[PDB]
Design a protein around this ligand. Structure first.
Ligand code: ZN
Length: 46
């Protein structure tokens, strides 16, 4: 199922490393197990 989403395409989604679920960029944790993403915010070590 795909709908009009030019502002937020499903391609921008992410893959929860816990269960391997797909989620949008809006949230951070998987919408099932709540596997709060790890690599989201701008990670700039140094
Ligand atoms: Zn998950």
């Amino acid at each position: 199922s795909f709908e009009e989403d030019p502002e937020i395409s499903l391609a921008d989604y992410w893959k929860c490393t816990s269960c391997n679920e797909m989620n949008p960029p809006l949230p951070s944790h998987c919408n099932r197990c709540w596997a709060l993403r790890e690599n989201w915010l701008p990670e700039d070590k140094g």
